[PDB]
Amino acid sequence: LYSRKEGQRQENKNKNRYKNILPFDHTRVVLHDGDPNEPVSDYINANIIMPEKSYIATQGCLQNTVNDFWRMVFQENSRVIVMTTKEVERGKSKCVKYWPDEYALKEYGVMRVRNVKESAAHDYTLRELKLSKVGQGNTERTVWQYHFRTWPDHGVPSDPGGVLDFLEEVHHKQESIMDAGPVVVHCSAGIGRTGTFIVIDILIDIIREKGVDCDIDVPKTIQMVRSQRSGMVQTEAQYRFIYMAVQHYIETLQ
Numbered sequence: 001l002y003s004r005k006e007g008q009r010q011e012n013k014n015k016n017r018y019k020n021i022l023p024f025d026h027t028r029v030v031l032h033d034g035d036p037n038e039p040v041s042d043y044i045n046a047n048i049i050m051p052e053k054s055y056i057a058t059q060g061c062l063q064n065t066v067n068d069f070w071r072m073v074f075q076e077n078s079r080v081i082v083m084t085t086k087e088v089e090r091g092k093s094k095c096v097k098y099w100p101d102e103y104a105l106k107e108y109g110v111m112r113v114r115n116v117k118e119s120a121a122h123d124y125t126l127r128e129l130k131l132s133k134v135g136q137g138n139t140e141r142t143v144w145q146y147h148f149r150t151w152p153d154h155g156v157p158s159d160p161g162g163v164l165d166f167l168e169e170v171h172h173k174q175e176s177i178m179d180a181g182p183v184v185v186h187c188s189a190g191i192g193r194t195g196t197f198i199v200i201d202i203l204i205d206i207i208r209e210k211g212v213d214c215d216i217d218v219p220k221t222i223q224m225v226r227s228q229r230s231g232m233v234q235t236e237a238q239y240r241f242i243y244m245a246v247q248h249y250i251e252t253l254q
């Protein structure tokens with residue numbers, strides 16, 4: 001009940017930044033209505049992560065997966081994107097530029113993206129973009145891209161403050177959009193940094209509906225998200241960052 005067949009198919013080998021980091025088939029994001037000329041067009045390295053508000057854990061775009069990325073965003077109806085990495089860190093590409101330059105607009109396949117406005121904050125940049133299907137400007141929607149950019153080249157942030165203030169914002173943005181789709185989260189492989197944010201965001205929403213006293217079980221939550229995408233949270237720094245984040249959030253509310 002836990003296969004990764006599709007991700008291993010010969011035709012999707014170029015659609016993964018790491019041959020060894022693949023999506024489970026049951027939680028795999030299936031892409032419909034793609035170019036009928038392509039051998040396979042229903043694939044993208046991304047999994048739906050639903051607590052048990054949903055999330056989409058994926059890798060940063062590859063030069064050849066950018067259109068797939070937007071098709072996913074359009075289909076799933078996502079309205080918020082969380083980029084947890086720079087395009088390149090320590091001379092290594094983690095995500096290709098998949099959004100247009102300021103005030104510009106590009107067409108990625110059948111998807112038109114207009115960069116409406118870019119605004120900076122301490123740890124991140126917010127990009128207001130308009131997504132629509134070419135020729136059908138009756139499908140346009142705004143997608144808010146939250147680009148975290150101060151994450152350290154090595155290890156994790158020494159203080160959770162930034163990430164928390166960041167996620168509070170992403171949070172209210174998501175709840176201000178009527179029935180917005182899953183929140184897309186992505187880093188280089190979509191498991192390490194990506195898992196950490198999601199796990200944190202998940203635990204924080206609990207402390208929201210519940211109170212600063214509810215039963216919080218980190219290992220259980222992590223285990224839970226890993227059953228939907230393996231690798232979620234890969235380092236000890238990340239692991240401990242989650243604990244710190246949660247405690248910091250608690251102490252903040254007080």
Ligand SMILES: CCC(/C=C/C(=O)O)=C\CC[C@H](C)C[C@@H](C)CC[C@H](O)[C@H](C)C(=O)C[C@@H](O)[C@H](C)[C@@H](C)OC(=O)C[C@@H](O)/C(C(=O)O)=C(\C)C(=O)O
Nearest residue numbers: 017018062063092093096187188189190191192193194234
């Ligand atoms: C935009 C560039 C381009 C187009 C060029 C063109 O216009 O023509 C094409 C990209 C080609 C291609 C997809 C990329 C190419 C470099 C080769 C693919 C990988 O580079 C390769 C498997 C590899 O060998 C990488 C590893 O050496 C890697 C560092 C290892 C130690 O490390 C990890 O596995 C990353 C991991 O620690 C990690 C992270 O914190 O980055 C994770 C999980 C995370 O938090 O997300």
